[PDB]
Amino acid sequence: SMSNRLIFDADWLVPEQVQVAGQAIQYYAARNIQYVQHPVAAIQVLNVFVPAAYLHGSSVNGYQRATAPILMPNTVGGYLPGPADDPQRVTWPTNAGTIQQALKRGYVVVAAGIRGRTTVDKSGQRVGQAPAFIVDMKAAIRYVKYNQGRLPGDANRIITNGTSAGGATSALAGASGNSAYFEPALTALGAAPATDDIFAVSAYCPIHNLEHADMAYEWQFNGINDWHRYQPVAGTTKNGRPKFEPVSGQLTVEEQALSLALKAQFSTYLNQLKLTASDGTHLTLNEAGMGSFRDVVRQLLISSAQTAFDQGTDIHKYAGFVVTGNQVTDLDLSAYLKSLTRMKAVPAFDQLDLTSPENNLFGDATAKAKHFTALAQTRSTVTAQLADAELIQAINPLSYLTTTSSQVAKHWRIRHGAADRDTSFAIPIILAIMLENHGYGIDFALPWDIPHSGDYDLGDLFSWIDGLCQ
Numbered sequence: 001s002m003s004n005r006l007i008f009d010a011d012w013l014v015p016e017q018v019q020v021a022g023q024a025i026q027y028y029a030a031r032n033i034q035y036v037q038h039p040v041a042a043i044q045v046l047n048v049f050v051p052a053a054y055l056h057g058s059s060v061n062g063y064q065r066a067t068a069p070i071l072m073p074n075t076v077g078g079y080l081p082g083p084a085d086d087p088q089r090v091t092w093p094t095n096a097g098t099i100q101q102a103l104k105r106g107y108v109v110v111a112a113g114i115r116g117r118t119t120v121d122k123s124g125q126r127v128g129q130a131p132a133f134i135v136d137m138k139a140a141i142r143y144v145k146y147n148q149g150r151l152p153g154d155a156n157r158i159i160t161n162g163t164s165a166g167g168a169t170s171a172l173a174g175a176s177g178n179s180a181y182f183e184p185a186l187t188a189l190g191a192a193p194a195t196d197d198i199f200a201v202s203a204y205c206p207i208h209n210l211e212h213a214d215m216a217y218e219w220q221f222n223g224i225n226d227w228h229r230y231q232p233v234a235g236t237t238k239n240g241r242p243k244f245e246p247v248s249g250q251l252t253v254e255e256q257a258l259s260l261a262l263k264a265q266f267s268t269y270l271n272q273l274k275l276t277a278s279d280g281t282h283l284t285l286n287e288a289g290m291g292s293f294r295d296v297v298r299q300l301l302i303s304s305a306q307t308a309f310d311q312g313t314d315i316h317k318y319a320g321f322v323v324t325g326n327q328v329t330d331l332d333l334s335a336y337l338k339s340l341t342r343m344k345a346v347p348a349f350d351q352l353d354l355t356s357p358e359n360n361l362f363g364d365a366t367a368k369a370k371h372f373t374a375l376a377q378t379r380s381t382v383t384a385q386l387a388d389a390e391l392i393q394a395i396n397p398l399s400y401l402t403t404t405s406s407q408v409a410k411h412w413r414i415r416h417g418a419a420d421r422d423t424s425f426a427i428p429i430i431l432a433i434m435l436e437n438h439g440y441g442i443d444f445a446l447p448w449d450i451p452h453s454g455d456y457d458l459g460d461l462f463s464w465i466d467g468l469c470q
């Protein structure tokens with residue numbers, strides 16, 4: 001209610017500890033903070049964790065109470081609700097380990113609870129579909145920045161982090177700072193009267209650019225007709241990890257047809273982006289999906305393999321790589337992709353029967369699911385509606401990156417595993433290049449043999465953060 005003044009009190013912080021790397025790490029915690037005046041869902045709370053030194057006037061890793069970076073991780077996966085995280089949390093989903101390490105590194109951590117596609121209110125109406133996820137992320141950022149100087153850490157040094165859907169969430173927060181589009185939603189929530197532009201973005205395999213992901217996916221996996229992924233089983237746990245029974249299928253001629261068309265459409269979309277290499281040349285693809293852009297994808301995978309090769313890794317686990325002496329000199333991209341295997345069917349994202357997580361994301365209180373591409377809407381196998389064009393645009397990080405804006409985060413670090421088949425490599429690569437082209441700092445790589453995951457290189461993530469903030 002309006003009784004919630006959204007004023008943080010350091011007095012709320014109580015002492016706790018956790019074991020990390022053979023050491024006891026002491027911190028303080030304030031949990032279950034209602035970060036808007038008018039929440040519609042119980043998940044809309046945030047947890048604050050603070051290195052103990054900052055409540056004793058002291059330093060960690062060159063940081064103080066006033067100057068510490070504020071890492072704002074989220075637990076969003078599959079565009080599902082993301083509960084407020086906790087270094088003590090053991091139930092799925094959680095990046096508790098990351099919080100532990102971050103506190104050890106001297107970062108303030110603000111772990112916000114985020115609505116997702118399955119979230120219902122008191123009446124049982126859906127209130128977590130798009131753009132609830134980013135609205136909540138922004139509202140939590142606004143709470144932190146409103147409470148600058150009351151809350152430990154530098155609110156001008158907010159660094160978001162997330163994996164997959166959560167990576168898109170993090171990238172979107174960095175891209176869309178102070179966007180007028182989200183103002184009516186934030187106002188109706190009673191979010192804090194402050195800005196939501198952030199300092200830096202960490203994103204692991206950001207599942208974004210959803211309206212172009214089907215085209216990118218088929219550009220990559222066309223010619224490969226068997227798909228291999230995972231699906232629900234159960235068994236009672238102690239901490240709710242939803243378990244994955246395998247299922248594989250075989251592309252129908254209808255599917256193959258869509259695939260070939262989708263692949264072709266990707267050339268057109270890609271070319272109109274006017275992406276440039278650092279030499280300044282237009283990155284392109286021809287009608288068959290070959291060209292300088294494909295060569296860039298190939299070079300990043302080659303770079304990935306070389307790093308692994310130099311560490312004694314057997315890169316021939318996958319097919320396609322040419323090694324000449326001590327150098328990965330070339331790559332048969334098609335052979336590699338076939339050895340990697342296709343994961344999703346066709347379309348990969350905007351399914352014709354509205355059964356994808358992204359279909360459900362684009363639903364509303366009235367519609368459980370919607371299409372978000374013209375092709376899937378035209379070829380729908382169920383009665384369906386197209387999601388609003390402005391909404392699709394609003395939750396795509398790329399929409400904001402057509403210029404150097406002061407509202408866009410200046411510092412970006414993006415990773416997508418070289419064994420991650422959940423979206424085309426082209427998707428994070430486009431994001432990476434567009435950032436570079438427009439003058440933003442961008443640290444990008446496709447880490448060797450890394451599956452759909454995140455937070456696996458914390459030592460390098462934290463080194464990157466420290467390079468920015470100290």
Ligand SMILES: CCOC(=O)c1cc(O)cc(O)c1
Nearest residue numbers: 077078079164165207357422
């Ligand atoms: C399975 C967890 O990762 C996700 O967040 C995710 C989200 C998507 O929209 C699609 C996907 O393959 C994974």
